[PDB]
Design brief:
The structure is a homotrimer of 217-residue chains.
Chain A: E1 4-9, E2 12-20, E3 26-35, E4 40-43, H1 49-63, E5 67-71, H2 77-80, H3 83-88, E6 92-96, H4 97-105, E7 113-115, E8 123-126, E9 129-132, E10 144-147, E11 152-156, H5 178-188, E12 194-197, H6 206-214
Parallel strand pairs in A: 4-5, 5-6, 6-7, 11-12
Antiparallel strand pairs in A: 1-2, 2-3, 3-4, 8-9, 9-10, 10-11
Bound molecules: zinc ion (ZN) (6 copies).
EC number (chains A, B, C): 3.5.2.6
Enzyme class (chains A, B, C): hydrolase
Binding site for Zn(2+) 1 (chains A, B, C): 74, 76, 78, 138
Chain lengths: 217, 217, 217
């Protein structure tokens, strides 16, 4: 069950790695590779260093656009489990200040560069993407990332897969605000008809609606 | 008004970028590129990431001496506005501990490596240059950098342009010590007949004398 | 007395640099270069940046396996005196949290990445090596590194040379625990018949036994 790559749009790729989570078998986690002119940028590691090193190699060897920098969408091991590989492979890593503090607390390696988007609704442009902090949801520090050329919204773990009603790992969730965070992301990026959850298949905006329903108070 | 490069001496180049500062039009900021055997070092970013990326590209493509490391002469956006570009482009950045703390406070990105020159008069050798902390002046953390082969003193923003009497952005100035800081730099580097201010043209030691006069208590 | 390289095993090299320590003449310090498939990893700097830059160049030019990352075995200038060179040359550096804190206190540059092995007996795998914190000895933060293919134990400064009875620089030593730390390292890596001290020649396990004897309460 090695790392998979699939095209989502012009210059936009999904990476997927798998980890057995007992007693439930293999759980996928998804991130993105986004091409620029002669390099690429990364959204999230995979589960560990070996999977993450495969992603770096694939961008270099298949796209011929080496990964120069990355952004991490919250402090859990599906999104930051491969930080050491990124650092050793010359990738310049970015996360929010809160994400880095939580990463250190949780035994994960922090990113090298801090983004300051602590207020709900804060948005910044990063490497041609829009990063939004929509408020706490799956994790207090969760961020979303929008690719406005193809109109692809990376919801990460804040967006649940398909029509599930399961909530996933809620150890760090903000159960009170999660549905509002989803609405905030949906309202910020109305043109994005492709939505990417971490733990399921690419879908459309129906997975924003389903997630907001199943997590609503 | 794109980034300009001009030769100051053997292996020493000035980079200049421009920013409109309302209501006064385009304001230049200057830094240096200094060649070593097969790489170069940088003094200051330009105003932003795009200008700073042009500087990195020009060293690689025109000098064939890629920028390996940089030093930043205080925590303002003319000197550190391009830090993210440097970090993404593999440049190893240096600043004093005070500069990094002020950068974080001011919303700028800190350098990756800390120099400890906190006492007035402290000097260190860095990549064949002499770095001096002459005391607070234009900004409490301002440093100067001397290139002793061509005898070029980079005064940065601590040295005002030409015969102006205007003081520039004094929000963070040490008005009591600035003239003494200028004298300290002048006495430390007597052989340097080329003096580079951030916001005006290269000149000689008369701009040390003029600055010390116009900022004197 | 320039930097020396000697083969210890398949893909494992010792680097040695020298520094005059008045009034006693030239003192060697040793570290390792360990090959991987198309890159190498480094154990310790040499005494300063120039020596450390020679090591980086030799891995690139002679092994054709550039140094990608390094580990530092405690916060003294024989092990971390070349950090600035590593950082400028693109090496991703690692040390324990305690080592980094001591480095900053002692005027050395900290590593870029923190390992958390603070409890006596903690072991981690790093780049195919086993890193062990055996407890305080030569320095409170000393770690050892084992290369299990050739069975080479890098004892660093925690292991004294040959049959000496001298203790070296004990400014930061844990004289009460040092012999137990040596025993802990010996028991953790029983198969390693090649043992490398920082300040003497490669030897066998007799230098573990001698060190434990001469430092025992
Ligand atoms: Zn999560
Ligand atoms: Zn997740
Ligand atoms: Zn300024
Ligand atoms: Zn200025
Ligand atoms: Zn030592
Ligand atoms: Zn030593």
């Amino acid at each position: 069950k090695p790392v998979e790559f699939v095209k989502l749009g012009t210059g936009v790729w999904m990476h997927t790695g798998y980890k057995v989570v007992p007693p439930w078998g293999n759980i996928r986690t998804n991130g993105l590779i986004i091409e620029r002119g002669d390099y690429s940028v990364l959204v999230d590691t995979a589960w560990n260093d070996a999977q993450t090193a495969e992603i770096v190699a694939w961008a270099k060897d298949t796209l011929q656009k080496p990964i120069r920098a990355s952004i991490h969408t919250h402090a859990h091991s599906d999104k930051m489990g491969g930080m050491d590989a990124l650092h050793m492979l010359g990738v310049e890593t970015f996360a929010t200040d809160l994400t880095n503090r939580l990463a250190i607390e949780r035994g994960l390696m922090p990113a090298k560069n801090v983004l300051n988007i602590s207020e709900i609704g804060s948005q910044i442009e990063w490497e041609g993407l829009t990063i939004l902090y929509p408020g706490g949801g799956h994790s207090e520090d969760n961020i979303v990332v929008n690719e406005g050329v193809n109109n692809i919204l990376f919801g990460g773990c804040m967006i649940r897969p398909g029509m599930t009603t399961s909530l996933g790992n809620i150890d760090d969730a903000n159960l009170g605000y999660w549905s509002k965070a989803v609405e905030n992301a949906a309202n910020a990026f109305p043109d994005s008809q492709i939505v990417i959850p971490s733990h399921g298949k690419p879908a459309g905006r129906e997975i924003l609606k389903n997630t907001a329903y199943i997590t609503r108070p």
